[PDB]
Design a protein around this ligand. Sequence first.
Ligand SMILES: COC1=C(OC)C(=O)C(C/C=C(\C)CC/C=C(\C)CC/C=C(\C)CC/C=C(\C)CCC=C(C)C)=C(C)C1=O
Ligand code: SF4
Ligand code: SF4
Ligand code: SF4
Lengths: 262, 157, 134, 267, 286, 199, 64, 150
Amino acid sequence: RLQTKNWSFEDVHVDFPKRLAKLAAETGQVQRLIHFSDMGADENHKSLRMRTKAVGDKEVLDAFPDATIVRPGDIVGIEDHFYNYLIYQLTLTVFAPVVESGSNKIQPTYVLDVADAVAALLRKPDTAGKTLYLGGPEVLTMREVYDLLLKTLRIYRDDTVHLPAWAVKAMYKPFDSVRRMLPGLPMTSPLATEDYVEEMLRDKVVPAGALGYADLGIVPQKVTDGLAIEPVRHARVGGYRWGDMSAVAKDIPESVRKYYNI
Amino acid sequence: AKGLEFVVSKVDNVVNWARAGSIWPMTFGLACCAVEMMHAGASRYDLDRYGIIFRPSPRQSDAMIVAGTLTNKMAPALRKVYDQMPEPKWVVSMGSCANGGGYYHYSYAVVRGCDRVVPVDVYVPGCPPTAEGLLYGLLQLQKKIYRSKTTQIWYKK
Amino acid sequence: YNAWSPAQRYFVEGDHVVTAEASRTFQFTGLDSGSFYPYVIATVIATAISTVFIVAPLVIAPSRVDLDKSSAYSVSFYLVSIMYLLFDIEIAYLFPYAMTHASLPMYWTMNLFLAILVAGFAYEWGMGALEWRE
Amino acid sequence: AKVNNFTLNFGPQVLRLVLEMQGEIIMRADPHIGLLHRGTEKLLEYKTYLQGLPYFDRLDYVSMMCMEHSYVLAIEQLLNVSVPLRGQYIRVLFSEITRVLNHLLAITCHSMDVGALTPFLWAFEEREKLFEFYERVSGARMHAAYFRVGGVSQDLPIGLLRDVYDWARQFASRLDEMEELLTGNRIWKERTVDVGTITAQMAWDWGCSGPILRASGIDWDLRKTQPYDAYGKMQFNVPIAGHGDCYDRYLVRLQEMRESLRIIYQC
Amino acid sequence: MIVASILILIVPVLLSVAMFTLAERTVMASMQRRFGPQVSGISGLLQPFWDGLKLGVKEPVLPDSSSAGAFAASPMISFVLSQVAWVGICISDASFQGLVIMAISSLAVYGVMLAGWASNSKYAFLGCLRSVALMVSYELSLGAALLSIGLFVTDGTGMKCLNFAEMPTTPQYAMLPLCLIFLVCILAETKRDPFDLPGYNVEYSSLGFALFFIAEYANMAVMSAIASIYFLGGFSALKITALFFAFVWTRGTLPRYRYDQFMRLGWKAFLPLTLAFFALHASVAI
Amino acid sequence: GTERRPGESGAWKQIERQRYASDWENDPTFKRTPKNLAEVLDDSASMLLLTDVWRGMAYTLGAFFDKKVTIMYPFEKGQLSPRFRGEHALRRYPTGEERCIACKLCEAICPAQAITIEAEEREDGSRRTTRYDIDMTKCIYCGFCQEACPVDAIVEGPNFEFSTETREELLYDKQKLLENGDKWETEIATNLRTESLYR
Amino acid sequence: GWNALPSLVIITGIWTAGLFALDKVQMFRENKPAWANNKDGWQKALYRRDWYLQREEETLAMAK
Amino acid sequence: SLSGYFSRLLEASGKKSVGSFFASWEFGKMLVDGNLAHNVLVRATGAGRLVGTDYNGNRYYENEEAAYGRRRWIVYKDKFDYNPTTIPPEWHGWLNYINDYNPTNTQFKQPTYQIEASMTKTGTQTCYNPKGSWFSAKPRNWRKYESWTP
Ligand SMILES: COC1=C(OC)C(=O)C(C/C=C(\C)CC/C=C(\C)CC/C=C(\C)CC/C=C(\C)CCC=C(C)C)=C(C)C1=O
Ligand code: SF4
Ligand code: SF4
Ligand code: SF4
């Protein structure tokens, strides 16, 4: 996600996938090669990581012709890089910049659905050589995602500010010309780059007519509510907690109320 | 480049000297093997001589010593206490019961190895292992900590 | 603090005294007797040191996100707190006595003060209020 | 007023306790057990009688050969097997060594739970000496599998009784220096005197046995009322106290260590 | 020059705290017929430093159900108060220096109570009140002991004070029972044996925990220096070591009290004794 | 001493009982009331000025100046016996032929079922194993297999220092057990020259 | 025991060296070995008069 | 005699001079490893005699005036990675107080198939692994039948 003085985007997204596909085709016993790229990968993208990802996808499909290319959206999970950095942006900062109106559309998905998708790909022989886009059942804008996180966190002060893209790039420029000649620093956000600003000026959704979750037989889980949103409910102010728990403890038996001290 | 890589390697040397010489384990005295762990801490073998302090809370604990059999009723509690320890942490499985179920391997109530619940760094064999064998296993865990190179790996990322 | 008047400077005229006072070194045997100024500097320096202790493991330590790591692992105190409040006030009253070379009527006044103290204390003892069974 | 009980969860880390308090005073205690239930009673049905013997070492793993003893005696009674004289003497001697090990651990773990740390470290070196005695005859420091149907597994190696006598010659001094820290100390007394009192009627109604029963004024020792092996030949006393106290149980346990030393010397 | 003097004071305080915690381990081991730390450095002389560096690279656990500011502030407050009290011992000339240190040590209660309020543990809230009750109960006997001490402290000009440089340089033989009460009060303030039943830092890891223990050992050294000034005829290195050895010696050989037991001790034994001694010394001082 | 006092009673019912009734004076384990001045001074020097704490302090200070019982592992070792049950091992004759003859007695007696054996006849007609596994994480180290063996093929040797980093390193097959026997053969023979007088 | 002697010696040496260094530093700041004495209002008045008259003597010296 | 102390130190460390001893990396590790520091500097230089040397270079000492169970000790030749798995079995029973036999007083019978003792290989990739493992030269499928290949 970020460049370093030891590793560039081409080294990781281009050169290594090409050599991996070549060495995989050399063995003869490899029957399946699953390569992961992004939903917003495009050779005509201003963001460097999307462009190098699409170039490496082309190199993989060239060297290993039956390799499957998988392009999921934003992945939510306990250890993800999507809600975690957004929560670290809503809290722990004086202000949270939002690129333009925040009306660019995304299609986030759950990590267990992607894990099931890999096994469903390994089952189905037709999916060899194809490209699949993995996105959840809801299309959302970044403003809607920020509103959902602010409602879920129970924060009563919107600390976000909408900014023009040149202002966001001017903020992120000093810590991008110094990203090389440095071994990589902890607690640096992957959203503090110009590539994220270029990604925010475009839609990242499933294309029309593409192969998705439904062709794998998978109904993807909702991302906004349910088990996927439970980790961010633990970071709310005060704690998660149950409540007063006394309206429903009316006809509960004897030892239970005393056990819970109700 | 050569000087900074030399400095980074010496930072790993000092950090590994600190972490191996300051292991604070957490006691799960489930069964038989806990008595030999008590004998390891006693005056003959003196685990405190090697910098080992037994800690009551998981937040101050650097390692976990599973000393005894693990049942199906005790497995989520062990997992929960393991999840509350901070990084970096290690797990030492002690005795046949924690290693693979041991003498209760075919029972309806026993977890066949603590590997099935938590990942394990060093396995000490015996039923029970002697306190001196547990010293051997802990010195081996120290040897595993010595081969780590964290800042050298970070420097080349 | 610097002196702002000729009377505060022992009627010494000139501009050398004003600059010499404004740029003086701290001295308990000069102008800063009994000063309590090192107590503030000690607070600032120790707060700096403890903040550096707090911040540093956020950089040089490993970290892993888990939902279970971020989770939890009487009226006698009212008696103690209120009694401690009253007894601390009484000891603060007794302190100006001990810092004087007291005459005999001062001694008997102080003993009347202490007698009222210990009479209330002995009443609460006799009613079983210092037996901390609850 | 209408004061509800405040409840408390006491330790997953293997006793679980659910207390109820009315302030600082407990009204109820409910132990939740089964965190070490490994189903050994079911597993013994799938073993032969020799195969199932090392299960008994792992029941009271502070006192191993005494757990073996009752299983062996139960098999021997149904088999109508007689044990020879030397085997009976060896069984009595190692049963009393086992009792000394258990009482050392019990008293010092109790005093460490109260807060005294030094007697633990003093008694565990004596425990190490008796573990060496276990290892020299069975090859295992704890789970010996020594007592068998009809006798013991191996003979005593030449040179064991010499060293057991050399340990027993100084054990009374060790017990003496142990009591200088605890017996006449006011903090230990204030922690132990009149705490958890058991009367005789409550002791028999609640199925009590052992040093609890002797601290409530009951003269009942199975080695003197229903003797087994060569315990009827042994000359020793039954210690008796009469308060049912923690302090009285501590004194009874120390005296039982003295009497076990007496039986060891006679054997 | 004040900043320089304060930093030159701060260096041996932290070095001494590391060596105190090592010496406690090793003396406690020698009483128990073992060795204690010997492997970690030659003669074990690097063990506290590797403990500190191990906690330095340890992960900081910030629970996402507590208030982060008070949680961070509690060990900082404890450490700052210990360092300020040491500065009051050595870099002051105030007239009421003992009253200043008593006021500082009365502020040290806040770290315990902020740790009890911040962390969302059931028994941390239960134990913080007990620890605060113990410290609060023995502070009054410390204050009445200071009253008895100050009745005889006069400088050359004839003014009565609590200035440490005006204290006599001979042991106070007339106040031996008050000295014993002072030492047991020091044991009660530092939550040592036999008052170690209440812990409050059950949720703290890495350098917040390290700050808690540095503050505890530095406060022990403060109280040792105070007792040596008041009763032993001066502040010295040998007296600091001897009183620390005495505290570790008591921790080796004694069990601890119950909560109500030391509450009854502090409110029915130590406070009436210190007040009666104050009345007797006031009668003598006329 | 083991004597009791009214006041040193650890509970509340007995504390309430001793201060409202004189039933404690009948009990012989209680300390009696002092009768004259010197006895009152002895009782006060017991309660005040401690002197019961000091005896324990004198004992622990004597222990501070006494000898220590710590051994410096791994430069110094403990004490064991030839009967010690350590790491399992497979043995040979002095010629170099295996002692084991695949009788499957050690597999039958094993209470942990830690032994798995398969066999067929060798090309010279001999009766030898083709598989001999010991799950060391299932083993209970009883020594029953050593007792059941009629040709002294399987033993528990004198090795106790064999902790590993992976559990797959503790599933011993036949080749590793023979390698253990080839390592430890002289020590095993020295131990068995004494223990054959008893077994 | 002999293992407890080095840490106990080091505590004494640390406090001796630190108190010696702190003494030399504060002696350089104050220039008299009674700076820590109690001072009443008369002694404070005397020190403040001495400081101001020393400044006056310095001012009058740089005029001849 | 301090000359006796230094002669004992040089014969125990295996160096040639005090300058070679104090300028070595062995003394550098003895400044950071106190267990080795105590064993070389205090125990090996004390009262006692040298018994023998194994083929790995470790030296064996004894002292009959010591306490029981602290009469015998070893000075490992590997100063940086010392391990008890390098003790040969003909010294193992002597050092563990199992028997009173060593090569200096007892001629052991040497089998023709005997493998010498060396340091453990656990934690490395050259450790023992079962025959069905990924790290084997050829993993086994343990099927007990033969499949038909057309
Ligand atoms: C039974 O009692 C005990 C405990 O239980 C209450 C314990 O928990 C611990 C363990 C905890 C410790 C040692 C933490 C407290 C001490 C610390 C962090 C040491 C403080 C030392 C400092 C600041 C100096 C070290 C720093 C230096 C030299 C700077 C280095 C800089 C460069 C090289 C550039 C011990 C030893 C103990 O006995
Ligand atoms: S492995 Fe053996 S000694 Fe250890 S707990 Fe299990 S049965 Fe007991
Ligand atoms: S020693 Fe016991 S557990 Fe091990 S193989 Fe032999 S019979 Fe089985
Ligand atoms: S090792 Fe012995 S008992 Fe086991 S199969 Fe071979 S010959 Fe039979």
